[PDB]
Design a protein around this ligand. Structure first.
Ligand SMILES: CCCCCCCCCCCCCCCCCC(=O)OC[C@H](COP(=O)([O-])OCC(O)COP(=O)([O-])OC[C@@H](COC(=O)CCCCCCCCCCCCCCCCC)OC(=O)CCCCCCCCCCCCCCCCC)OC(=O)CCCCCCCCCCCCCCCCC
Ligand SMILES: CCCCCCCCCCCCCCCCCC(=O)OC[C@H](COP(=O)([O-])OCC[N+](C)(C)C)OC(=O)CCCCCCCCCCCCCCCCC
Ligand SMILES: COC1=C(OC)C(=O)C(C/C=C(\C)CC/C=C(\C)CC/C=C(\C)CC/C=C(\C)CC/C=C(\C)CC/C=C(\C)CC/C=C(\C)CCC=C(C)C)=C(C)C1=O
Ligand SMILES: Cc1cc2nc3c(=O)[nH]c(=O)nc-3n(C[C@H](O)[C@H](O)[C@H](O)COP(=O)(O)OP(=O)(O)OC[C@H]3O[C@@H](n4cnc5c(N)ncnc54)[C@H](O)[C@@H]3O)c2cc1C
Ligand code: SF4
Ligand code: F3S
Ligand code: FES
Ligand SMILES: [K+]
Lengths: 259, 48, 604, 82, 164, 87
């Protein structure tokens, strides 16, 4: 009979959020935390709201803060004990309802880096897939697996202080994924844009990002590599390069972009 | 009619890591140095 | 934003086209439409990257010659044989002929495909694929990105959509379609979960790219969000739904969790072993033992467990022995499998077998469509009439490319090809700039009243209890081997479940992320599709593809080579009855490049 | 409180509203003005400081080494301590 | 301008082009970038205008001057609007209290929706006034509105393009 | 608020205290030691058995008339002599 404490907030009432405790029999519940939340909703309090889809850990919609450390509820294991299990939404996020966070800023930041392959020459007729050796493809192994759960985003103290200026561990990891990719031909443009004091250099090497990653990726390692590459490759003409790309985006629709 | 809530500071509850604490110490090295200089300066003026 | 007063605050939007779904199918269609220059709006319950296409593992089939010499015609023949001759040969030719281009285009947008020594895209052997029209051996056509091909496809398509600057209405739940009195579709009416307001999107051409209804069963590999909402919207509009009885069971799904272990596990050397330790798959489908069609493997596994040769304490499952395979290969080309087994099954793949059992995976049935991805409203005189302004793509639709049984890695191909095809069809019908569509005066009047009544619905039976009851019946009454007597009893039970949706009640009454309300609305879609599955399955007195009947253990081509349409009598599931009608299958390929494939025995 | 609702935002470089960004620029000038002024202290110390044991030093050079050439016999133990 | 320096047209073209890309390539969203750089831009811009005065009809220098001036106009306009948004966000943060606990919470903004209506109206004006600087406008003001949209639920035309 | 011993706030404080307090105390002690080194050379405390005998000797050596000198006992072990006729 484990005790579960769940963060609760009603957007209509707009009352002070509080922690409500539920008692669940682990015998009739699945091992994972998400199973307990579903059982609570099904049996005791159907008003509880939370984002869930996969059950495998691949989609990354069920990111939550369990016992003070971010994680995905579907992969997190229930640890029975006298101490109640505390479940809260992602830290320093605007809660839409109960455990459902407001991650719109995270999506906007991700769209900013333009995560799509860019090439100077369009695919010539009769040309098949772009050449890429196994060795080059191996460089992307630790970076293309991100599920965008935002556990790392909300565990970075620098993101707590400057959410609207700092891209965060997840978006910076993806930016280096396209920089590292051999097929992409806009490496200098991407490095020039990311070379900003707020966007990139707010990372202070705290490493709360790598610790909580559900998929075991290493955003801190990738962020460190990107800084080293930028420092070695900087040229006086990078600022002009950013401006020229901004002119190329003049006719784009509204939304975050390269500018 | 509907408004979203803002959570408190994560510092009060978020779990700590050994590396995270050490980084704070790294950033506070100069602050401590200034503090010690001030203490010695005060002692040199008010003691003995 | 407009601003109207239909008991709620209704924001009226006007667009040239409106896709409903942000999965693989929906993302491709939106990118195509915007590329053609039409103003488009994509609506989704979830952020696009979190759709169930992300959970796809195996890969996408293409007739590239990267590993072995292949021909798209050979791939087409396999699809016809896999469909058990209930698949449209017109649609199959279109899909197979375009597969090489589609895959290469995906790589052109940055998809991280695994690479060969020479730098070409790597391909793997997947069940049901052969060379030289079956004369040859196993075919390596499944382009892959390790065990995360679905994750890569969805991210790349989302990047493509960002490049074309598509408009996304994220976290919007779609209610019924807006239908003209003439029978055309003039758009969709949806609810914003984040804001709580209702939105009426009005478009000349609509695309329904929702998922399947796999959550109607107790044990499924489908996501919690796979409630088949698009099909329910079409059914409530009075339009038919096709081939709902054919429900695929993936042979390999972790037991008891239901998580999937990719068919590529067997495609890279995995074996299935019974209590005796025998590789039982030799007895069934000898030429391709573990690479036989999914339905054949699933039926064999169920028979073996029934025979008493199951494994584990309770003889309830079978084992998948990947331990003999080299550790380096397992990590290189099956990384995701190892972690999933380590967590949910508590198994070390390198040294131990994985518990496995068949589980509902994919729904071959869906909204009827032609090879152009246009929704169909068949009539006795015209068996291929098209709804004037409606289109479907993805698992939601049934172009019949997959027919009775789906070939592994053929679904992801279907998403992109028909998602791309849907955009082309809309572009021809609708010019880049056209006068805004005129919604009917009472547009959404019925939907709001139904939505309001459910919002204030108070009754003894809860949504969770009713959904649990529905899943129990479907799992027990529609297993891999379906008996007619059980199906008849299940048909009565599901009809009772439809009636008691009248008594459903929700405790929550807000409009912002009211998951209790949303689940109740989803349950309505789940019930109606589940009912048609049982009724269609009970009516079909044969055994074809996934649909296997012990009472009728034979494939009747004379009197049963016909698609099975299903109609909902009235918009309200409570007051409706299921009616069945049939339309003939299309067997003649559109072009002469691919010859007709006459029906024949399907042994594999 | 109630923030004013009739703010005339800047329209171009020659029709500008006074905002905190401009006030920050004024801070930049003032803090940098302090840096110029505070530089006088270290410069003043170096220019004015002297290090001499007593007034005899000047008298010794005036009487025993006026040209800074007069060599003196070295006896290491004097300044070596031992 | 009071100066005795003389420059050829080739030098004047280079100076004007360098300044134009320096301003446009800079990240306007970061307030400190404008605070630190604007004093340098103004000093240079004064020199560029003086040396490029005889080339205002030149087929090469002319267009560069027009774009340079237009970009500086947009930079000041976007900064002013985003500066007001920052004030609104800071007021909201201080209203939370100490440690976000409300321990010493200040008075909230009583007319938040009115401010959102005012800011969005200004945002629309920038888009119409500077049709060739939308990427920069979205970077500074458009993103600012998205942050405000988290605090308060209001409607603006591009809200759906920011995942709202 | 929600407070936990394993929180970043509390754990950082303990880490800072353990890391810096040993350094600071050593650094402060070293400075105190240097001050003591100069103090003892400039004026080393010296103990006298009897105050009266020492005070009389002090007056004799310096040629000070005891009448004009005021003697007071600041503490149990400290006695101070001052000029009576001091501005
Ligand atoms: C390669 C590496 C190189 C690294 C190099 C880095 C160098 C950094 C240098 C930093 C500056 C340090 C300067 C120290 C100078 C003092 C020592 C000295 O010179 O001694 C010889 C000599 C003094 O010795 P002296 O001849 O014996 O004369 C005696 C003194 O003059 C007598 O002094 P005074 O009487 O004139 O004044 C005494 C003094 C000393 O102060 C006091 O005396 C204070 C006394 C306090 C008493 C409080 C009482 C409270 C009572 C509470 C009761 C509670 C009861 C509870 C009861 C509970 C019951 C249950 O008072 C003050 O300073 C004013 C008051 C204090 C103000 C500040 C208060 C806030 C402190 C902020 C701390 C910041 C750190 C935060 C830490 C946070 C940690 C988390 O110096 C002088 O005469 C000149 C003094 C000024 C020299 C300044 C030189 C500056 C050099 C700057 C170089 C910068 C280089 C770095 C880069 C460039 C940066 C811009
Ligand atoms: C082209 C490169 C240009 C680089 C410029 C760099 C500028 C650096 C400025 C440093 C300032 C440091 C000031 C310290 C305080 C000194 C105060 C003082 O007592 O001064 C008087 C005294 C006079 O000495 P005094 O012996 O008469 O005694 C004065 C009184 N006592 C002894 C008590 C100090 O000493 C000096 O003059 C100090 C040295 C001043 C050096 C300043 C920097 C010189 C930079 C030269 C640049 C060369 C350019 C090369 C190319 C040339 C091409 C033609
Ligand atoms: C506002 O929310 C916050 C942010 O925004 C979200 C931040 O970014 C950040 C990050 C910012 C930084 C790291 C910058 C540096 C921040 C620092 C140094 C900390 C700043 C905050 C503070 C110093 C806290 C403010 C001060 C306090 C809360 C006071 C602390 C002392 C307290 C509460 C003791 C008072 C107790 C009493 C009055 C009780 C008295 C008891 C009695 C009378 C009992 C008597 C009993 C008897 C028997 C007679 C923080 C810390 C934050 O709190
Ligand atoms: C575990 C697993 C593994 C698989 N692996 C493979 C594989 O390797 N290869 C393969 O070919 N096939 C595979 N499949 C099948 C294939 O992935 C699916 O058929 C395919 O993802 C269907 O995609 P879709 O775009 O049609 O819709 P889905 O991905 O199912 O998602 C439907 C979309 O519509 C949205 N939506 C639904 N209802 C509503 C509503 N009411 N209002 C608004 N939006 C709504 C959803 O949020 C979502 O965005 C797998 C299936 C599963 C479950
Ligand atoms: S790095 Fe890990 S925790 Fe962060 S978003 Fe990606 S998968 Fe999630
Ligand atoms: S925790 Fe944050 S500071 Fe850098 S190392 Fe990770 S992004
Ligand atoms: S539900 Fe998607 S990661 Fe758990
Ligand atoms: K690159």
């Amino acid at each position: 009979m484990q005790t579960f404490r769940v963060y609760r907030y009603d957007p209509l009432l707009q009352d002070k959020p509080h922690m409500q405790e539920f008692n669940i029999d682990l015998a009739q519940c699945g091992p994972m935390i998400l199973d307990a939340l579903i059982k609570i909703k099904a049996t005791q309090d159907s008003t509880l709201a939370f984002r869930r889809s996969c059950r495998e850990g691949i989609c990354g919609s069920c990111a939550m803060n369990i016992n003070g450390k971010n994680g995905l509820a579907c992969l997190q294991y229930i640890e029975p004990g006298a101490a109640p299990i505390d479940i809260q939404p992602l830290p320093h996020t605007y809660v839409l309802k109960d455990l459902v966070p407001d991650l719109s800023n995270f999506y906007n930041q991700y769209k900013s880096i333009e995560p799509f392959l860019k090439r100077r020459r369009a695919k010539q007729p009769g040309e098949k897939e772009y050449y890429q050796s196994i060795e080059d493809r191996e460089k992307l192994d630790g970076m293309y697996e991100c599920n965008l759960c935002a556990c790392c985003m909300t565990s970075c103290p620098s993101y707590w202080w400057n959410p609207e200026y700092y891209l965060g561990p997840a978006v910076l990891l993806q930016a280096y994924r396209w920089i590292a990719d051999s097929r992409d031909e806009f490496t200098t443009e991407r490095m020039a844009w990311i070379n900003d004091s707020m966007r990139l250099y707010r990372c202070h090497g705290i490493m709360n990002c790598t610790s909580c990653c559900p998929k075991g990726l290493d955003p801190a390692k990738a962020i460190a590599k990107m800084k080293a590459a930028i420092a070695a490759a900087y040229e006086p003409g990078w600022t002009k390069i950013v401006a020229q790309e901004s002119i190329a985006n003049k006719k784009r629709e509204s939304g975050m972009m390269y500018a | 009619s509907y408004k979203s809530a803002h959570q408190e500071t994560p510092l009060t509850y978020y779990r700590a890591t050994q590396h995270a604490t050490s980084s704070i110490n790294h950033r506070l090295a100069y602050i401590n140095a200034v503090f010690v200089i001030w203490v010695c300066d005060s002692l040199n003026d008010v003691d003995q | 934003a407009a601003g109207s007063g239909t008991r709620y605050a209704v924001h009226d939007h006007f667009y040239d086209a409106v896709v409903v779904g942000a999965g693989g199918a929906g993302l491709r269609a939106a990118s195509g439409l915007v590329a053609h220059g039409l103003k488009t709006a994509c609506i989704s319950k979830v952020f696009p990257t979190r759709s169930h296409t992300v959970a796809a593992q195996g890969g996408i089939n293409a007739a590239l010659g990267n590993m072995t010499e292949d021909d798209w015609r050979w791939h087409a023949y396999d699809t016809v044989k896999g469909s058990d001759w209930l698949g449209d040969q017109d649609a199959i030719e279109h899909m197979c002929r375009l597969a090489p281009q589609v895959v290469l285009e995906l790589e052109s947008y940055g998809l991280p495909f695994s690479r060969t020594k020479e730098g070409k895209i790597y391909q793997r052997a997947f069940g049901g694929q052969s060379l030289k029209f079956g004369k040859g051996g196993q075919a390596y056509r499944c382009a892959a990105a390790a065990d995360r091909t679905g994750h890569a496809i969805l991210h790349t398509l989302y990047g493509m959509s960002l490049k074309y600057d598509c408009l996304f209405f994220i976290e919007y739940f779609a209610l019924d379609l807006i239908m003209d009195q003439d029978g055309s579709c003039k758009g969709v009416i949806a609810m914003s979960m984040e804001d709580g307001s209702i939105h009426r999107f009005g478009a000349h051409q609509t695309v329904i790219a929702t998922g399947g209804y796999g959550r109607a069963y107790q044990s499924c590999t489908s996501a919690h969000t796979c409630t088949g909402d698009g099909g329910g919207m079409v059914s409530r509009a009075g339009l038919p739904l096709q081939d709902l009885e054919f429900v695929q069971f993936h042979p390999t799904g972790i037991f008891p969790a239901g998580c999937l272990m990719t068919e590529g596990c067997r495609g890279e050397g995995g074996i299935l072993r019974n209590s005796e330790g025998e590789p039982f798959m030799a007895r069934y489908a000898p030429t391709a033992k573990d690479l036989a069609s999914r339905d054949v493997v699933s039926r064999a596994m169920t028979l073996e467990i029934r025979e008493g040769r199951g494994v584990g304490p309770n003889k309830d499952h079978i084992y998948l022995h990947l331990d003999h395979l080299p550790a380096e290969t397992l990590r290189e080309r099956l990384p995701g499998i190892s972690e999933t087994a380590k967590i949910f099954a508590g198994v070390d793949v390198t040294k131990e077998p994985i518990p496995v059992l068949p589980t509902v995976h994919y729904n071959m049935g869906g909204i009827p469509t032609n090879w152009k991805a246009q929704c169909l409203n068949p009539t006795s005189s015209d068996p291929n009439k098209i709804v004037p302004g409606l289109l479907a793509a993805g698992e939601a639709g049934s172009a019949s490319v997959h027919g009775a049984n789906r070939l592994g890695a053929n679904s992801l191909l279907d998403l992109v090809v028909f998602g791309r095809t849907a955009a082309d069809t809309v572009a021809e019908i609708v010019k880049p700039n056209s006068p805004p569509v005129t919604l009917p005066k009472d547009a959404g009047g019925g939907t709001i009243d139904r939505f309001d009544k459910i919002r204030h619905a108070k009754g003894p039976v809860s949504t969770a209890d009713l959904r649990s009851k529905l899943q129990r019946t479907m799992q027990t009454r529609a297993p891999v081997y379906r008996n007619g007597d059980d199906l008849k009893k299940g048909c009565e039970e599901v009809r009772e479940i439809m009636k008691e949706y009248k008594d459903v009640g929700i405790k929550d009454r807000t409009l912002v992320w009211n998951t209790d309300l949303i689940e109740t609305l989803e349950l309505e879609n789940l019930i109606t599709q589940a009912a048609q599955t049982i009724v269609s399955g009970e009516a079909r007195k044969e055994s074809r593809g996934a649909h296997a009947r012990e009472d009728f253990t034979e494939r009747d081509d004379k009197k049963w080579m016909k698609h099975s349409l299903s109609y909902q009598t009235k918009p309200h599931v409570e007051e409706s009855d299921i009616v069945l009608k049939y339309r003939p299958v299309v067997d003649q390929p559109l072009d002469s490049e691919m010859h007709h494939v006459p029906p024949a025995k399907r042994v594999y | 409180a109630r923030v004013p609702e009739d703010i005339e935002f800047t329209k171009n470089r020659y029709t500008r509203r006074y905002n905190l960004a401009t006030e920050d620029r004024v801070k930049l000038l003032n803090w940098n003005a302090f840096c110029i002024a505070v530089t006088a202290l270290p410069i003043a110390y170096v220019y004015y400081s002297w290090y001499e044991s007593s007034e005899d030093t000047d008298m010794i050079y005036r009487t025993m080494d006026p040209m800074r050439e007069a060599k003196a016999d070295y006896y290491l133990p004097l300044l070596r301590g031992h | 301008m009071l100066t005795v320096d003389k420059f050829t047209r080739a030098e004047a073209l280079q100076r004007a082009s360098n300044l134009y890309y320096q301003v446009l390539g800079t990240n306007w969203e970061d307030g400190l970038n404008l605070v630190l750089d604007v004093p340098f831009w103004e000093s240079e811009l004064e020199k560029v205008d003086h040396m490029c005065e005889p080339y205002l009809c030149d087929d090469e220098i002319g267009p560069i001057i027009r774009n340079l001036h237009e970009t500086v106009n947009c930079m000041y306009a976007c900064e002013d609007v985003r500066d007001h948004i920052n004030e609104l966000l800071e007021l909201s943060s201080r209203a939370e209290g100490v440690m976000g606990s409300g321990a010493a919470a200040s008075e909230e903004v009583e007319n938040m929706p009115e401010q959102c209506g005012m800011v969005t109206k200004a945002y629309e004006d920038l888009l119409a006034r500077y049709p060739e600087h939308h990427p920069k406008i979205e970077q500074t003001v458009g993103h600012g509105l998205a942050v405000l949209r988290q605090l308060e639920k209001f409607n603006f035309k591009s809200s759906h393009r920011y995942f709202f | 608020m929600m407070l936990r011993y394993d929180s970043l706030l509390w754990q950082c404080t303990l880490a800072a205290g353990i890391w810096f307090i040993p350094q600071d105390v050593a650094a402060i002690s070293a400075f105190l030691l240097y001050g003591r080194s100069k103090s003892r050379t400039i004026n080393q405390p010296v103990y006298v058995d009897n105050i009266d005998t020492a005070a009389n000797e002090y007056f004799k050596r310096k040629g000070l008339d005891p009448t004009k000198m005021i003697m007071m006992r600041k503490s149990s072990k400290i006695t101070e002599i001052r000029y009576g006729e001091m501005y």
